[PDB]
Each structure stands twice: as C-alpha cells, then as structure tokens.
C-alpha cells in the first residue's frame, strides 16, 4: 500500500515524507529505526518514532538492553512496532560525529535483507553525520529486498533524486 514513491531501482523506492506519518498511514510489517547501541531514542528519527509511541518504544528498549546488553555498531534487533507497524527493526549505523567507522554502513544495511519489505530512513544520515548521497548509494548496492525510503527534508530529497 505504499503510494507516491519514485522508483530508483528494481527494489529501492524513495519519497519526501515524515517516516512517522508514513508509518501511521500504512502500518507496514516493518519500520526501521535509526538506533544507537544503547537503544536510547533521544533525537533524530529515533526520538520522533519513540515520541509517536508515547514512550512505549523506550520502555520496551530499556528492558531489552537490561536483558541482552548493547547492540554492535552495524547490528540490529527486532522489537514491537507498537502503534506504528507490526515490528520495528532497530538498526545501528555508524555515527561519524562519535568517530565511528563509515565502513560499517554496509553491514548495517545488510540487516534489511532479512525482511521482504521495509519502511526506512537513510542510515547514518542526519545527526549521525555521514553523507546522505553515500548512504543512498550503499543502500542501493546492498539491500536486495523491497525498501521504501522516507526522506523528511524536502531539500535533501531533491538533492538525492537529482544526483542519483
Ligand atoms: O530524511 C531525513 O531528512 C533524515 C536523514 C537521516 C534521518 C532522517 C530523519 C531525521 C529526523 C526525522 C524526524 N521526524 C521524522 C522523520 C525524520 C527523518
């Protein structure tokens, strides 16, 4: 039921949209969160998704970390999607503003291949400090399953499409 997306490749689609409003409308099987290793959803996409769940995402995430410990950079976990989706795939891309290695971005996108279809943001972009044009290139060259990318900033969406 995804609508208004521009087809970039056989399996990658993109739209200028707020991933929160997109999730509420579609209720996809999987929404991807741009997580950190501690699942502390303070800002960016994670802060927005968590606020839309009335903090239920953060309560579930704190129980997951108390049991399992932190994720790896490049890793992921599957938790509830709450009121937004059936599942939330929390994926940790490298944070360049914390000095993490951009080379781990391909490993982060490989987590998407475990799900037939996903609603997602660009990993390591925004407050994680990587170049979004690079993040879209790694996405297209790594993900083989059907990915619907929601880009919040209109100016960035136009730059990503015009330079693809
Ligand atoms: O698409 C973007 O412009 C950026 C790229 C990196 C993460 C994206 C982002 C960031 C904050 C968001 C806040 N609310 C809703 C969706 C949000 C999406």
In CATH, what number is assigned to the domain containing residue 15? 3.40.220.10
Q: Give distance in angstroms: CA of 43 to centre of ligand 1.
A: 10
Which region holds residue 55: left if phi is over 0, alpha if psi is between -120 and 50, else beta?
left
How many domains does the chain contain in total?
1
List the beta strands (DSSP E) in 92-144: 117-120
CA of 152 to the centre of ligand 1 (A): 5
Q: Which domain holds residue 31?
A: 6-161
Separation CA 56–CA 110 (nearest Å): 27
**CB-based contact 52:58 (threshold 8 Å):** no
Distance, CA 72 to ligand 1 centroid (Å)? Answer: 22
Task: List Cβ neighbours of 108 (8 Å cut-off, separation of 6 or more).
Answer: 73, 74, 75, 76, 91, 92, 93, 94, 123, 124
Residue 114: how many other CB atoms lie within 10 Å: 12
In ligand 1, which atom is closest to the CA atom of 128?
6
Resolution in A, one decimal? 1.2
The number of angstroms, rounded, from the C-alpha of 73 to the middle of its chain's C-alpha atoms is 14
Write out the two tokens for 55. Answer: 């903090």
Nearest CA to ligand 1 atom 7: 126
In a domain, 1, yes or no: no
User: Residue whose CA is closest, atom 12 of ligand 1?
Assistant: 45
Do the domain assignments include residue 27? yes
Does residue 122 lie within any of the structural domains? yes
Mutate to test the pocket of ligand 1, among 42, 121, 161 (most ligand atoms within 8 A of CB): 121
What the block records as the tokens of 96 is 């360049």
**Domain-embedded: residue 123:** yes
CB atoms within 10 A of CB 50: 24
**Reading across the β-sheet that carries 87-91, which strands appear in turn?**
6-7, 12-16, 146-151, 117-120, 30-34, 87-91, 76-80
Taking the C-alpha atoms of residue 31 and residue 119, their distance in angstroms, rounded to an integer, is 5
Name the residue with the closest Cα to ligand 1, atom 17: 45
Q: Considering the domain boundaries, does residue 66 fall inside one?
A: yes
């Amino acid at each position: 039921s995804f609508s208004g997306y521009l087809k970039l490749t056989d399996n990658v689609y993109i739209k200028n949209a707020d991933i929160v409003e997109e999730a509420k409308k579609v209720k996809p099987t999987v929404v991807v969160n741009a997580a950190n290793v501690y699942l502390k959803h303070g800002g960016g996409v994670a802060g927005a998704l968590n606020k839309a769940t009335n903090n239920a995402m953060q309560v579930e995430s704190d129980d997951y970390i108390a049991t399992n410990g932190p994720l790896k950079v490049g890793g992921s976990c599957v938790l509830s999607g709450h009121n937004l989706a059936k599942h939330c795939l929390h994926v940790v891309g490298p944070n360049v503003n914390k000095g993490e290695d951009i080379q781990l971005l391909k490993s982060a996108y490989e987590n998407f291949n475990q799900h037939e279809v996903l609603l997602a943001p660009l990993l390591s972009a925004g407050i994680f400090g990587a170049d979004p044009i690079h993040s879209l290139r790694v996405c297209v060259d790594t993900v083989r399953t059907n990915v619907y990318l929601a880009v919040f900033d209109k100016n960035l969406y136009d730059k990503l499409v015009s330079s693809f």
